[PDB]
Amino acid sequence: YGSWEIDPKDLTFLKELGTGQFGVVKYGKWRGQYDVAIKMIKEGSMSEDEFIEEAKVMMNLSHEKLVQLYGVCTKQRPIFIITEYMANGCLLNYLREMRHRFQTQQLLEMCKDVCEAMEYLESKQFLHRDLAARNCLVNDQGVVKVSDFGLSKFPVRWSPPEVLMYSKFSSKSDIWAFGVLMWEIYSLGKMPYERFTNSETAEHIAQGLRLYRPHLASEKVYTIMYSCWHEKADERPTFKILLSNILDVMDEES
Ligand SMILES: Nc1nccn2c([C@@H]3CC[C@H]4COC(=O)N4C3)nc(-c3ccc(C(=O)Nc4cc(C(F)(F)F)ccn4)cc3)c12
Ligand SMILES: CN(C)CCCC(=O)N1CCC[C@H]1c1nc(-c2ccc(C(=O)Nc3nccs3)cc2)c2c(N)nccn12
């Protein structure tokens, strides 16, 4: 993989962070100085050679609000993925930690960070295909970044009606999921439609049921997340519009 190939001799493992979706993740250093996360691609977990379109995606996409790939160690097994280190870990766990006592301006900033990454992915005509708080990470400064981008159990509770009924994926199904991710942020990590199963959620969504306004979301913030859930996909905003709406609310409320 040319310049993306990292020499595993340059890595030093400092602590196991936990079992990531797809293998063990560890905090470590590159050439003793740079902080990195090291994902060990689990042995025979998914397909490899042909499935390495995910590395082509990680190697061609780059944004300040996307978790950055630094390199790979593929001349060995298990394969290592070296990425930017996100000290506060997964957004969903970060939201659930009641000790942060978040103010609403901090929650809207988390939405803006994700919206910026998504406007960038929209501009490259790329679909995340699993946008949710579980796939976002938080760095030491509280900056949220989107990870596992377009990786590749179906995320029923983040899907619009046309996806659940017809597998109609579009930029608008990522808009819908983003509205659900804003709801996860403003509810401090509640499971969307927490009283329902996936099957009950799909039928209620087809019937026009929508997630309620979380207590911490103002009417203006709620209007932004609710605009992502229009039944007609063409009536949902673009990520550029959502970003301008979020910036307007931050200037007004803050
Ligand atoms: N960069 C990270 N920093 C800190 C913590 N991190 C965790 C924690 C694991 C334990 C759970 C538990 O608690 C918590 O906070 N969690 C988060 N995962 C990642 C992380 C590291 C690397 C990747 C990664 O390699 N992504 C990738 C890989 C592919 C590829 F190549 F394999 F196809 C394609 C697309 N994306 C993903 C997440 C990171
Ligand atoms: C050489 N000097 C700078 C040493 C810096 C220290 C260094 O080399 N480090 C520190 C951590 C692991 C290792 C490492 N980092 C990277 C990397 C790649 C892209 C961007 C980026 O920002 N890309 C963007 N693309 C578009 C927009 S921004 C940032 C970093 C790479 C790489 N491509 N191959 C091998 C090793 N690599």
CSV table of C-alpha atoms and ligand atoms in Angstrom, one decimal:
chain,number,residue,atom,x,y,z
A,1,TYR,CA,0.0,0.0,0.0
A,2,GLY,CA,2.9,2.4,-0.8
A,3,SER,CA,3.4,5.3,1.6
A,4,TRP,CA,0.5,4.0,3.8
A,5,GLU,CA,2.5,0.9,4.8
A,6,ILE,CA,3.8,1.5,8.4
A,7,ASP,CA,6.7,-0.5,9.7
A,8,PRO,CA,5.3,-2.4,12.8
A,9,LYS,CA,8.8,-2.0,14.4
A,10,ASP,CA,7.8,1.7,14.9
A,11,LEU,CA,4.8,0.8,17.2
A,12,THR,CA,4.8,0.5,21.0
A,13,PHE,CA,1.7,-0.8,22.7
A,14,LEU,CA,0.8,1.1,26.0
A,15,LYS,CA,-2.7,-0.1,27.0
A,16,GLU,CA,-5.7,-2.2,25.7
A,17,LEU,CA,-8.7,0.1,25.2
A,18,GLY,CA,-11.2,-2.6,24.8
A,19,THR,CA,-12.8,-4.9,22.2
A,20,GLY,CA,-13.6,-2.8,19.2
A,21,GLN,CA,-16.4,-3.9,16.9
A,22,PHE,CA,-14.1,-5.7,14.5
A,23,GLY,CA,-11.1,-6.6,16.8
A,24,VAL,CA,-8.9,-5.5,19.7
A,25,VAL,CA,-8.0,-1.8,19.8
A,26,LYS,CA,-4.9,-0.5,21.7
A,27,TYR,CA,-3.5,2.9,22.6
A,28,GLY,CA,0.2,3.2,21.6
A,29,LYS,CA,2.9,5.4,20.1
A,30,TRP,CA,4.6,5.7,16.7
A,31,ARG,CA,8.4,6.2,16.8
A,32,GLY,CA,8.0,6.7,20.6
A,33,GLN,CA,6.4,10.2,20.2
A,34,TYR,CA,3.1,10.2,18.3
A,35,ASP,CA,-0.2,9.0,20.0
A,36,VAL,CA,-2.0,6.4,17.8
A,37,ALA,CA,-4.9,3.8,18.1
A,38,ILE,CA,-3.9,0.4,16.8
A,39,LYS,CA,-6.8,-1.8,15.6
A,40,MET,CA,-5.9,-5.4,15.1
A,41,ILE,CA,-8.0,-6.7,12.2
A,42,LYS,CA,-9.5,-9.8,13.7
A,43,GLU,CA,-8.3,-13.1,12.2
A,44,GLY,CA,-10.7,-14.3,9.4
A,45,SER,CA,-13.5,-12.1,10.8
A,46,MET,CA,-14.5,-10.5,7.4
A,47,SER,CA,-13.3,-10.9,3.9
A,48,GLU,CA,-9.9,-9.3,3.1
A,49,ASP,CA,-8.1,-8.9,-0.4
A,50,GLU,CA,-11.3,-7.9,-2.4
A,51,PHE,CA,-12.9,-6.3,0.8
A,52,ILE,CA,-9.9,-3.9,1.0
A,53,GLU,CA,-12.0,-1.2,-0.7
A,54,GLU,CA,-12.5,0.0,3.0
A,55,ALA,CA,-8.7,0.8,3.1
A,56,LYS,CA,-9.0,2.5,-0.4
A,57,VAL,CA,-11.9,4.5,1.2
A,58,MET,CA,-9.8,5.3,4.4
A,59,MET,CA,-6.8,6.1,2.2
A,60,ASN,CA,-8.7,8.6,-0.2
A,61,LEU,CA,-11.1,10.3,2.3
A,62,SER,CA,-9.8,12.9,4.8
A,63,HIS,CA,-11.4,15.6,6.9
A,64,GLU,CA,-10.7,17.3,10.3
A,65,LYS,CA,-14.0,15.8,11.6
A,66,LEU,CA,-13.3,12.2,10.3
A,67,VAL,CA,-11.0,9.9,12.3
A,68,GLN,CA,-7.8,9.9,10.3
A,69,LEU,CA,-6.0,6.8,9.0
A,70,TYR,CA,-2.3,7.0,9.5
A,71,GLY,CA,-1.3,3.7,8.0
A,72,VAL,CA,-1.6,-0.1,7.8
A,73,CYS,CA,0.6,-3.1,8.6
A,74,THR,CA,-0.5,-5.7,6.0
A,75,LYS,CA,2.8,-7.7,5.5
A,76,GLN,CA,1.8,-9.9,8.5
A,77,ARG,CA,-1.3,-11.4,10.3
A,78,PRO,CA,-3.3,-10.1,12.2
A,79,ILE,CA,-3.4,-6.9,10.1
A,80,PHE,CA,-3.0,-3.6,12.1
A,81,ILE,CA,-4.9,-0.3,11.2
A,82,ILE,CA,-3.1,2.7,12.7
A,83,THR,CA,-5.4,5.7,13.3
A,84,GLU,CA,-5.7,9.0,15.1
A,85,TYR,CA,-6.1,8.5,18.8
A,86,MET,CA,-9.4,9.6,20.3
A,87,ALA,CA,-8.8,9.8,24.1
A,88,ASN,CA,-12.5,10.1,25.1
A,89,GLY,CA,-13.4,7.0,23.1
A,90,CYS,CA,-16.8,6.3,21.6
A,91,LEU,CA,-19.4,9.1,21.5
A,92,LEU,CA,-22.2,6.9,22.9
A,93,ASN,CA,-20.1,6.0,26.0
A,94,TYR,CA,-19.0,9.7,26.3
A,95,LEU,CA,-22.7,10.9,26.3
A,96,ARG,CA,-23.7,8.2,28.9
A,97,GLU,CA,-21.0,9.3,31.4
A,98,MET,CA,-23.1,11.6,33.7
A,99,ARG,CA,-19.9,13.2,35.3
A,100,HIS,CA,-19.5,15.6,32.2
A,101,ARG,CA,-22.7,17.5,33.0
A,102,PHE,CA,-22.9,18.7,29.5
A,103,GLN,CA,-24.4,22.1,28.7
A,104,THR,CA,-26.6,22.4,25.6
A,105,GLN,CA,-23.9,24.5,23.7
A,106,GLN,CA,-21.5,21.5,24.1
A,107,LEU,CA,-24.2,19.1,22.7
A,108,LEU,CA,-24.9,21.4,19.7
A,109,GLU,CA,-21.1,21.6,19.0
A,110,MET,CA,-21.0,17.7,18.9
A,111,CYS,CA,-23.8,17.9,16.3
A,112,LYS,CA,-21.9,20.5,14.3
A,113,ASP,CA,-18.6,18.4,14.3
A,114,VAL,CA,-20.5,15.4,12.9
A,115,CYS,CA,-22.4,17.7,10.4
A,116,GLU,CA,-19.1,19.0,9.0
A,117,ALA,CA,-17.8,15.5,8.4
A,118,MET,CA,-21.1,14.5,6.7
A,119,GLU,CA,-21.1,17.6,4.5
A,120,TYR,CA,-17.6,16.6,3.4
A,121,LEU,CA,-18.8,13.0,2.7
A,122,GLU,CA,-21.8,14.4,0.8
A,123,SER,CA,-19.5,16.5,-1.4
A,124,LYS,CA,-17.5,13.3,-2.3
A,125,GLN,CA,-20.9,11.5,-3.0
A,126,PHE,CA,-20.0,8.9,-0.3
A,127,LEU,CA,-22.6,7.3,2.0
A,128,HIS,CA,-21.6,6.3,5.5
A,129,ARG,CA,-24.2,3.5,5.6
A,130,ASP,CA,-24.0,3.3,9.5
A,131,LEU,CA,-24.0,6.8,10.8
A,132,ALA,CA,-24.8,6.6,14.6
A,133,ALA,CA,-23.2,7.6,17.9
A,134,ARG,CA,-21.7,4.1,18.2
A,135,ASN,CA,-19.5,5.0,15.1
A,136,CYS,CA,-18.3,8.4,16.3
A,137,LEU,CA,-15.3,9.0,18.5
A,138,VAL,CA,-14.2,11.9,20.8
A,139,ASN,CA,-10.7,13.3,21.2
A,140,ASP,CA,-9.0,14.8,24.4
A,141,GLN,CA,-10.5,18.3,23.5
A,142,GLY,CA,-14.1,17.0,23.3
A,143,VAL,CA,-14.1,17.2,19.4
A,144,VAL,CA,-16.4,14.5,17.9
A,145,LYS,CA,-15.3,12.8,14.7
A,146,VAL,CA,-17.0,10.3,12.4
A,147,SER,CA,-15.3,6.8,12.2
A,148,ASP,CA,-16.0,3.4,10.5
A,149,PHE,CA,-17.0,5.4,7.4
A,150,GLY,CA,-18.9,3.3,4.8
A,151,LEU,CA,-17.7,0.1,6.5
A,152,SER,CA,-19.4,-3.0,4.9
A,153,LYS,CA,-27.6,-6.2,13.0
A,154,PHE,CA,-29.0,-3.8,10.3
A,155,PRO,CA,-29.3,-0.2,11.8
A,156,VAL,CA,-33.1,-0.2,11.7
A,157,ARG,CA,-33.5,2.6,14.2
A,158,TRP,CA,-31.3,5.0,12.1
A,159,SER,CA,-33.0,4.1,8.7
A,160,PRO,CA,-35.6,6.1,6.8
A,161,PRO,CA,-38.9,4.4,5.5
A,162,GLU,CA,-37.6,4.1,1.9
A,163,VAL,CA,-34.5,2.2,3.2
A,164,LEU,CA,-36.5,-0.2,5.4
A,165,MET,CA,-39.1,-0.9,2.7
A,166,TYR,CA,-37.1,-0.7,-0.6
A,167,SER,CA,-33.3,-0.6,0.2
A,168,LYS,CA,-33.4,3.0,-1.4
A,169,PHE,CA,-30.0,4.3,-0.1
A,170,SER,CA,-29.2,8.0,-1.0
A,171,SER,CA,-27.6,11.1,0.5
A,172,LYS,CA,-31.1,11.5,2.2
A,173,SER,CA,-30.9,8.2,4.2
A,174,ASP,CA,-27.6,9.6,5.7
A,175,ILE,CA,-29.6,12.8,6.5
A,176,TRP,CA,-32.3,10.7,8.3
A,177,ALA,CA,-29.6,8.9,10.3
A,178,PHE,CA,-28.0,12.2,11.2
A,179,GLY,CA,-31.2,13.5,12.7
A,180,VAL,CA,-31.3,10.2,14.8
A,181,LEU,CA,-27.7,10.8,15.8
A,182,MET,CA,-28.6,14.4,16.9
A,183,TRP,CA,-31.4,12.8,19.0
A,184,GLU,CA,-28.9,10.4,20.6
A,185,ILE,CA,-26.7,13.4,21.5
A,186,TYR,CA,-29.6,15.5,23.0
A,187,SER,CA,-31.0,12.4,24.9
A,188,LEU,CA,-27.5,11.8,26.4
A,189,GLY,CA,-27.2,8.4,24.7
A,190,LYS,CA,-30.7,6.8,24.9
A,191,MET,CA,-31.5,4.0,22.5
A,192,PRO,CA,-33.8,5.5,19.8
A,193,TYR,CA,-37.4,4.1,20.2
A,194,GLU,CA,-36.1,2.4,23.4
A,195,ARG,CA,-39.6,0.9,24.3
A,196,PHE,CA,-39.9,-0.8,20.8
A,197,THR,CA,-38.2,-3.7,19.0
A,198,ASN,CA,-36.7,-3.1,15.5
A,199,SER,CA,-39.8,-4.7,13.9
A,200,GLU,CA,-42.1,-2.4,15.9
A,201,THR,CA,-39.9,0.7,15.1
A,202,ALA,CA,-40.1,-0.1,11.3
A,203,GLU,CA,-43.9,-0.3,11.3
A,204,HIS,CA,-44.3,2.8,13.5
A,205,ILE,CA,-41.9,4.8,11.2
A,206,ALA,CA,-43.8,3.7,8.1
A,207,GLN,CA,-47.0,5.0,9.9
A,208,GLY,CA,-45.4,8.5,10.6
A,209,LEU,CA,-44.2,8.0,14.2
A,210,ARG,CA,-41.1,10.2,15.0
A,211,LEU,CA,-38.7,10.4,17.9
A,212,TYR,CA,-39.9,12.9,20.6
A,213,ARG,CA,-38.1,16.1,21.4
A,214,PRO,CA,-35.4,15.3,24.1
A,215,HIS,CA,-35.8,17.6,27.2
A,216,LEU,CA,-32.4,19.2,26.5
A,217,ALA,CA,-33.2,20.1,22.8
A,218,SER,CA,-34.8,23.6,22.3
A,219,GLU,CA,-37.7,23.9,19.8
A,220,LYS,CA,-35.1,25.4,17.3
A,221,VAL,CA,-32.7,22.4,17.7
A,222,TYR,CA,-35.7,20.0,17.5
A,223,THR,CA,-36.8,21.6,14.2
A,224,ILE,CA,-33.3,20.8,12.7
A,225,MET,CA,-33.4,17.1,13.8
A,226,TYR,CA,-37.1,16.8,12.7
A,227,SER,CA,-36.4,18.3,9.2
A,228,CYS,CA,-34.2,15.1,8.6
A,229,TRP,CA,-37.3,12.9,9.0
A,230,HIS,CA,-39.6,14.1,6.3
A,231,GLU,CA,-41.4,11.0,4.8
A,232,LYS,CA,-40.5,12.3,1.3
A,233,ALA,CA,-36.7,12.1,1.0
A,234,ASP,CA,-36.5,15.1,-1.5
A,235,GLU,CA,-38.0,17.4,1.3
A,236,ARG,CA,-35.1,16.6,3.7
A,237,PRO,CA,-32.2,19.1,3.8
A,238,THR,CA,-28.7,18.6,2.5
A,239,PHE,CA,-25.8,18.5,5.1
A,240,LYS,CA,-24.7,22.0,3.8
A,241,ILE,CA,-28.2,23.3,4.8
A,242,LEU,CA,-28.1,21.5,8.2
A,243,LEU,CA,-24.6,23.0,8.9
A,244,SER,CA,-25.9,26.5,8.2
A,245,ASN,CA,-29.0,25.9,10.4
A,246,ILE,CA,-26.8,24.5,13.3
A,247,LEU,CA,-24.4,27.5,13.0
A,248,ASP,CA,-27.5,29.9,13.1
A,249,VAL,CA,-28.8,28.3,16.3
A,250,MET,CA,-25.3,28.4,17.9
A,251,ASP,CA,-25.1,32.2,17.1
A,252,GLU,CA,-28.7,32.7,18.4
A,253,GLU,CA,-28.7,30.4,21.5
A,254,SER,CA,-25.1,30.9,22.6
B,1,LIG,N1,-9.1,5.6,17.3
B,1,LIG,C1,-9.5,5.2,18.5
B,1,LIG,N2,-9.1,6.0,19.5
B,1,LIG,C2,-9.5,5.7,20.8
B,1,LIG,C3,-10.4,4.6,21.0
B,1,LIG,N3,-10.9,3.9,20.0
B,1,LIG,C4,-11.7,2.8,20.0
B,1,LIG,C5,-12.4,2.2,21.2
B,1,LIG,C6,-12.4,0.7,21.2
B,1,LIG,C7,-13.1,0.2,22.4
B,1,LIG,C8,-14.6,0.7,22.5
B,1,LIG,C9,-15.2,0.5,23.9
B,1,LIG,O1,-15.3,1.8,24.4
B,1,LIG,C10,-14.9,2.8,23.5
B,1,LIG,O2,-14.9,3.9,23.8
B,1,LIG,N4,-14.6,2.2,22.4
B,1,LIG,C11,-13.8,2.8,21.3
B,1,LIG,N5,-11.8,2.3,18.7
B,1,LIG,C12,-11.1,3.2,17.9
B,1,LIG,C13,-11.0,2.9,16.5
B,1,LIG,C14,-9.7,2.6,16.0
B,1,LIG,C15,-9.6,2.2,14.7
B,1,LIG,C16,-10.7,2.1,13.8
B,1,LIG,C17,-10.5,1.6,12.4
B,1,LIG,O3,-9.5,0.9,12.1
B,1,LIG,N6,-11.5,1.9,11.5
B,1,LIG,C18,-11.7,1.4,10.3
B,1,LIG,C19,-11.1,0.2,9.7
B,1,LIG,C20,-11.4,-0.1,8.4
B,1,LIG,C21,-10.7,-1.4,7.8
B,1,LIG,F1,-9.5,-1.2,7.3
B,1,LIG,F2,-10.6,-2.4,8.7
B,1,LIG,F3,-11.5,-1.9,6.9
B,1,LIG,C22,-12.2,0.6,7.7
B,1,LIG,C23,-12.8,1.7,8.3
B,1,LIG,N7,-12.5,2.1,9.5
B,1,LIG,C24,-12.0,2.3,14.4
B,1,LIG,C25,-12.1,2.6,15.7
B,1,LIG,C26,-10.4,4.1,18.7
B,2,LIG,C1,6.4,13.5,7.9
B,2,LIG,N1,6.0,14.2,9.1
B,2,LIG,C2,4.8,15.1,8.8
B,2,LIG,C3,5.8,13.1,10.2
B,2,LIG,C4,4.5,13.1,11.0
B,2,LIG,C5,4.5,11.8,11.9
B,2,LIG,C6,4.1,10.5,11.2
B,2,LIG,O1,4.5,10.2,10.1
B,2,LIG,N2,3.1,9.7,11.9
B,2,LIG,C7,2.6,9.9,13.3
B,2,LIG,C8,1.5,8.8,13.4
B,2,LIG,C9,1.8,7.7,12.4
B,2,LIG,C10,2.7,8.4,11.3
B,2,LIG,C11,2.0,8.6,10.0
B,2,LIG,N3,1.1,9.7,9.8
B,2,LIG,C12,0.6,9.6,8.5
B,2,LIG,C13,-0.4,10.7,8.1
B,2,LIG,C14,-1.0,10.6,6.9
B,2,LIG,C15,-1.9,11.6,6.5
B,2,LIG,C16,-2.1,12.7,7.3
B,2,LIG,C17,-3.1,13.8,6.8
B,2,LIG,O2,-3.4,14.7,7.5
B,2,LIG,N4,-3.7,13.6,5.5
B,2,LIG,C18,-4.6,14.5,4.9
B,2,LIG,N5,-5.0,14.2,3.6
B,2,LIG,C19,-5.9,15.2,3.2
B,2,LIG,C20,-6.1,16.2,4.1
B,2,LIG,S1,-5.2,15.9,5.5
B,2,LIG,C21,-1.5,12.8,8.6
B,2,LIG,C22,-0.6,11.8,9.0
B,2,LIG,C23,1.2,8.6,7.8
B,2,LIG,C24,1.2,8.0,6.4
B,2,LIG,N6,0.5,8.5,5.4
B,2,LIG,N7,2.0,6.9,6.1
B,2,LIG,C25,2.8,6.4,7.1
B,2,LIG,C26,2.9,6.8,8.4
B,2,LIG,N8,2.1,8.0,8.8
